[PDB]
Amino acid sequence: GRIYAVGGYDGSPDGHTHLNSVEAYDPETDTWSLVAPMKTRRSGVGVAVLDGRIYAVGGYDGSPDGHTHLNSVEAYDPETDTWSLVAPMKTRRSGVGVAVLDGRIYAVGGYDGSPDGHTHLNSVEAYDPETDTWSLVAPMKTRRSGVGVAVLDGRIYAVGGYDGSPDGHTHLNSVEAYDPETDTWSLVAPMKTRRSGVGVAVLDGRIYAVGGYDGSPDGHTHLNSVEAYDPETDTWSLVAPMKTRRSGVGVAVLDGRIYAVGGYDGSPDGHTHLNSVEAYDPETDTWSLVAPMKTRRSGVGVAVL
What's the CA gap between 193 and 197, in Å, rounded? Predict the structure, then answer.
C-alpha cells in the first residue's frame, strides 16, 4: 500500500550524485518516509515487486570509479527493512525497463558501455526467484533505453524510449508487445508523441504513457503530456497533461490513481531535478500534486508494495 521511490540521479547543486536512497509514500497521511538504502547507487534503475519483495535491477552510476553500467540486482525485504544482492543479469543495463509477468521479472532494453560511449539494447532477460537465475528471451525489434514497460492482459508492452544506434529514429513513438506463449514481440499502434524517458502504468485496462522527452525535429520538448492506449481498439488518445514536465519519471498505480514521481524538467525556469509528485484520476481526468519527496530524483524507479 505504499509507493517506493528507489534510487535516481540527484543532479541538484546540493545532491550532485547517483542515489542509493529509497523513500516510501503513504497515501493515507500524504507523507514520504525513509526506507533502508540500497547497497548500490543506481539511476535509470528498473524496479518491480514480486512475492512481497522489491527488486532494483541494473541502472547507471556516472561516478568515475568502478563500473558505470550495472548488471547487479538487489531485493528489498520489507519485514527486515534490508536489501540483499541476488543473481546479476547477464548484461549491464542502464535506463532499463522492468516489469513482472507470470512470476518472473523481465528486464527490457537499456544501454551498456562501449569503447566509444554507450550501446543501446534490444535484448531482454527474465529472472526466476525460486532458482535465482536469469534467462534470455526474444529481443525486441527496436533497441530502446529509457523505455516504459507495462503488463496488460498477459503481454509486456515496451513503449517509446531512445534508440542511439545508427539509422532510424532516435526518440521513439513505437510500441511493441511481447507474447510469452510464443516468445515473440509484435508492433502495435505507435503513440501520438515520441517519448524517450517515458513512464508507463496500467489502470482500468489502459496503458498510460506519461511525460518523456520528444527530441525529434518539431519537438525538442520535455513533455507534460500523457496518452492512453486502448488494446481493444489499438489506439492511443491524449488525456489531461501533468502540472510539471517530466522525463525520466517513475510511474506507479496505487488506490485507483497513477502517480508520476520525480523526473527531469529541462524547460526554462524551476528546478531541473524533481522531487515533486502528482497523481492522476481517470474519472475526473485531472492531475494534482501531492507531498514532494525529500530527495530530487531523475531516472527514479518506483513500485508499489
Answer: 12
Q: What are phi and psi of 47, to 5 degrees?
A: -135, 135
How many structural domains are present in the chain?
A: 1
Across-strand partners of 172?
none
Resolution reading in Å: 1.4
DSSP state for residue 13 in the 8-state scheme: T
Q: Would you say 160 and 175 are in contact if contact means Cβ atoms under 8 Å apart?
A: yes
- What is the domain range of residue 30? 3-304
Grid cell locating 186: 509484435
Instruction: Return the C-alpha cell found at 250.
Output: 517513475
- Under 8 Å CB-to-CB from 240, ≥6 apart: which residues? 226, 280, 285, 286, 287
CB 294 within 8 A of CB 285: no
Strand order in the sheet with 148-152: 148-152, 155-159, 175-179, 184-188
- Non-local CB neighbours of 27 within 8 Å, separated by 6+ positions: 1, 2, 3, 254, 255, 290
Of 162, 168, 163, 269, which is closest to residue 212 (Cα–Cα)?
162
Backbone angles phi, psi at 43, to 5 degrees: -110, 165
Cα distance between residue 299 and residue 59, in whole Å: 9
Half-sphere exposure of 115 (CA within 13 A, CB side): 0
Return d(Cα 10, Cα 96) in angstroms, integer. 18
Cell 532494453 -> residue: 109
Rounded to whole angstroms, the Cα distance separating 261 from 139 reads 29
> Which CATH number fits the domain that encloses residue 10?
2.120.10.80
3-state secondary structure of 103: coil
